[PDB]
XYZ file of C-alpha atoms in Angstrom:
183
model
C -12.365 -43.074 60.768
C -11.239 -46.612 59.870
C -13.836 -49.349 59.730
C -14.117 -53.032 58.918
C -15.619 -53.065 55.427
C -17.405 -56.394 55.115
C -18.041 -59.755 56.745
C -18.940 -60.678 60.294
C -17.350 -57.523 61.762
C -18.492 -55.254 58.922
C -19.107 -51.642 59.878
C -17.282 -51.799 63.206
C -14.973 -48.854 63.987
C -11.241 -49.523 64.411
C -8.480 -47.420 65.948
C -5.637 -46.234 63.726
C -2.018 -45.819 64.741
C -1.078 -42.173 65.296
C -0.416 -40.456 61.979
C 3.162 -40.137 60.834
C 2.762 -38.919 57.224
C 3.650 -42.306 55.680
C 1.769 -43.937 52.764
C -1.673 -44.942 54.108
C -3.838 -47.981 53.404
C -7.228 -46.370 52.958
C -10.502 -48.159 53.615
C -11.253 -47.835 49.863
C -8.010 -49.658 48.987
C -8.742 -52.248 51.667
C -12.186 -52.828 50.096
C -10.650 -53.040 46.620
C -8.097 -55.603 47.796
C -10.550 -57.907 49.482
C -13.220 -57.722 46.819
C -10.570 -58.664 44.245
C -9.153 -61.699 46.096
C -12.351 -62.724 47.895
C -14.807 -61.204 48.535
C -15.230 -64.019 51.131
C -13.172 -67.025 52.225
C -14.034 -70.518 53.408
C -11.534 -70.518 56.259
C -7.755 -70.360 55.873
C -4.890 -68.660 57.659
C -3.627 -65.186 56.847
C -0.261 -63.575 57.555
C -0.194 -59.800 58.014
C 3.570 -59.250 58.049
C 3.501 -55.525 58.888
C 0.215 -55.544 60.730
C 0.262 -52.106 62.436
C -3.252 -51.472 63.710
C -4.381 -54.785 62.220
C -7.010 -53.577 59.748
C -6.104 -56.013 56.945
C -5.758 -59.014 59.275
C -9.152 -58.212 60.761
C -10.727 -57.770 57.320
C -9.466 -61.239 56.321
C -10.981 -62.957 59.378
C -14.179 -60.848 59.085
C -14.569 -62.217 55.538
C -14.223 -65.811 56.623
C -10.593 -66.715 57.268
C -10.044 -68.836 60.384
C -7.004 -67.047 61.801
C -4.599 -64.204 61.139
C -1.009 -64.056 62.429
C -0.068 -60.378 62.836
C 3.626 -59.366 62.994
C 4.606 -56.081 64.667
C 7.824 -54.029 64.596
C 6.925 -51.359 67.177
C 5.798 -51.783 70.772
C 3.462 -48.790 70.486
C 1.307 -50.639 67.941
C 0.563 -53.529 70.301
C -2.109 -51.731 72.356
C -3.835 -50.465 69.212
C -4.023 -53.874 67.546
C -5.161 -55.451 70.855
C -8.034 -52.934 71.078
C -9.045 -53.635 67.471
C -8.896 -57.404 68.024
C -11.128 -56.892 71.091
C -13.665 -55.102 68.874
C -13.997 -58.342 66.844
C -14.872 -60.168 70.092
C -13.047 -63.215 68.626
C -9.478 -62.865 70.015
C -8.784 -66.571 69.462
C -8.738 -65.895 65.692
C -5.665 -63.629 65.989
C -2.095 -63.991 67.101
C 0.073 -60.918 67.514
C 3.842 -61.394 67.608
C 6.361 -58.662 68.345
C 9.373 -59.660 66.240
C 11.402 -58.865 63.139
C 9.528 -59.696 59.898
C 12.300 -61.882 58.463
C 12.774 -63.743 61.754
C 9.003 -64.340 61.730
C 9.221 -66.249 58.438
C 11.869 -68.596 59.845
C 9.760 -69.173 62.953
C 6.799 -70.071 60.737
C 9.032 -72.655 59.054
C 9.973 -74.055 62.504
C 6.233 -74.211 63.224
C 5.488 -76.046 59.935
C 2.864 -73.426 59.004
C 1.306 -72.630 55.619
C -0.638 -69.495 54.733
C -3.601 -68.996 52.373
C -3.168 -65.204 52.325
C -0.079 -63.062 52.790
C -0.392 -59.286 53.205
C 2.804 -57.277 52.633
C 2.658 -53.538 53.346
C 6.273 -52.700 54.431
C 7.521 -49.168 55.182
C 8.956 -47.694 51.961
C 12.578 -47.862 53.163
C 12.234 -51.413 54.551
C 10.670 -53.017 51.477
C 12.074 -56.497 50.782
C 9.075 -58.146 49.155
C 10.994 -60.196 46.586
C 13.484 -61.601 49.145
C 10.652 -62.397 51.549
C 8.571 -64.173 48.934
C 11.628 -66.183 47.895
C 11.991 -67.156 51.578
C 8.324 -68.182 51.760
C 8.811 -70.398 48.699
C 12.072 -71.837 50.062
C 10.412 -72.767 53.367
C 7.128 -73.903 51.766
C 5.068 -71.424 53.765
C 2.271 -71.171 51.168
C -0.819 -73.311 50.614
C -1.543 -74.544 47.088
C -3.995 -71.694 46.383
C -2.265 -69.023 48.441
C -2.593 -65.434 47.327
C -0.071 -62.637 48.081
C -1.214 -59.026 48.308
C 1.568 -56.376 48.190
C 1.105 -52.676 48.876
C 3.915 -50.379 47.716
C 4.495 -46.834 46.565
C 3.448 -46.402 42.933
C 7.176 -45.983 42.015
C 8.139 -49.543 43.067
C 8.797 -51.989 40.187
C 7.846 -55.493 41.357
C 8.810 -58.346 39.013
C 6.379 -60.433 36.929
C 7.836 -63.656 38.289
C 9.161 -64.563 41.737
C 10.221 -68.207 41.702
C 7.017 -70.132 41.085
C 4.839 -67.084 41.829
C 3.372 -65.043 38.990
C 1.947 -61.526 39.125
C -1.758 -61.853 38.385
C -2.961 -58.257 38.899
C -1.527 -54.818 39.564
C -3.608 -51.697 40.173
C -2.712 -48.181 41.287
C -5.053 -46.278 43.596
C -3.659 -42.762 43.915
C -0.112 -43.336 45.132
C -0.767 -46.876 46.472
C 0.119 -49.782 44.211
C -1.570 -53.128 44.893
C 0.168 -56.164 43.407
C -1.217 -59.696 43.487
C 0.801 -62.928 43.158
C -0.398 -66.532 42.835
C 1.469 -69.846 42.200
């Protein structure tokens, strides 16, 4: 069963969305991601653009980030992420918004926000990572030391360079590819 790996909420059990045979984000991959980019953070704001049950957003805050904004496509996910946020007992550190992912980026621009961590785990058929990152650069949605974590099927070919972002690491764990970008 899914669990927070490390940090303040480490070891706490989380609820997963109902299975639908799509590419998972395993706890082992989650651990690998956060140990690579962290393992801990001195504050900051994270964006979890396809948050689902919220495991990555929660891991970020557990490990020291001040706040995660979690974007959701499907109404059904809202009760699951709410339950998981409740398990942290720090609901003020999370914001869940039910809206289109691309519309979310333009709202963040309206809100004059910048993110220290961006987590991008789109459904395979809705993957627009390069366009989205170009949008984030266009709208200056990234802090100076922001890091982007992408999760894709191992068959996806993400570019070495996206505007001022450069791929710094890329690792395959089974069929899940984790790609890291930094400015």
